Symmetry: C2
Subunit: 107 residues, 2 copies
């Protein structure tokens, strides 16, 4: 079976990739845990943590909880918990994804 | 220097991640080359090729040219060239990114 090369393109599509931005600091560096509506959030290939490369001397870390193609099922409270030998902390925000849940998705 | 854990979150932001979907077939599998407005496109961390995992028995490959945070500077023709021992092919589409080029970007 031989077949000459073929290719097809489709017009460009804007996906719906979201970022919940976060910053975490403390010394030593805190361990982290995300909660979604109060329960532990198990990271997947559509929902994961991504750090932005370390800053010059800064001890603080910056990043995103990344959500690819979130729908109403991802609505709710997202909480980042941080803990180290000297204390614990948490921050929470509410997030809703009401974009067209039926739009065509390439990935 | 000791410091208790701290954390800060910002409300969720939808980024502007785009996909130019493509499919490529041929036997043997074709080599590929992208052109942007006629010139070779050098892939970077903001502009890169991403394949969707191989299908069952299918010889054809599917994927995206991914563009993160594209602006008017990325406007133009995108051409995927494919070539193998039995032939060559190409497909081109026009793409324009006119979203707010000044919106806040987490990444």
């Amino acid at each position: 079976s031989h077949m000459p090369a073929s290719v097809q393109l489709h017009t460009a599509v804007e996906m719906h990739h979201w970022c919940i931005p976060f910053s975490v600091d403390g010394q030593p560096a805190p361990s982290l845990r995300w909660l979604f509506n109060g329960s532990v959030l198990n990271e997947t290939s559509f929902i994961f943590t991504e750090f932005l490369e370390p800053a010059a001397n800064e001890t603080v870390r910056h990043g995103c909880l990344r959500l690819n193609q979130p729908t109403h099922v991802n609505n709710g409270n997202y909480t980042l918990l941080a803990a180290n030998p000297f204390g614990q902390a948490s921050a929470s925000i509410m997030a809703a994804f009401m974009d067209n849940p039926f739009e065509f998705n390439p990935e």
